[PDB]
């Protein structure tokens, strides 16, 4: 039989506004954001099957536009000014499962209170060999 299991992979982000009072000089960043990659609360945690996650950022982040998180939590925290598609590449411990690309549209806070707010979530099902 060709047996598989579906697992949920959530790519989301949060962010908070950074008032001008708390920005350093010549820092064009208005926000601090965090992109996260995780499973659902109602199925097993994703360290069991994910080996690493690559983040591919906008070229404005060069030469640090390519970030590798090899161990949980699969999070990326950055200051910034703009929204853009974050490309997430999830590699699996069992190399039988081929790596998958997820595109996440970064959403930045517009309440501008300086508190952290939930931005967006991109949810996909992945198939793992069983």
């Amino acid at each position: 039989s060709r047996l598989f299991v579906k697992k949920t992979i959530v790519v989301g982000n949060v962010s908070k506004y950074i008032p001008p009072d708390k920005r350093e000089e010549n820092d064009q960043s208005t926000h601090k954001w965090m992109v996260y990659v995780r499973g659902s609360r109602r199925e097993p945690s994703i360290n069991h099957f994910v080996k690493k996650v690559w983040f591919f950022l906008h070229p404005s982040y060069k030469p640090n536009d390519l970030v590798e998180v090899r161990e949980p939590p699969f999070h990326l925290t950055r200051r910034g000014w703009g929204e853009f598609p974050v490309r997430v590449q999830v590699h699996f411990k069992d190399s039988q499962n081929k790596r998958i690309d997820i595109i996440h549209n970064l959403k930045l806070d517009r309440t501008y209170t300086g508190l952290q707010t939930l931005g967006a979530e991109t949810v996909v099902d992945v198939e793992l060999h069983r």
Partner: peptide, 8 residues
Amino acid sequence: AARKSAPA
């Protein structure tokens, strides 16, 4: 092209 834009 790689595009990026400020919400405000």
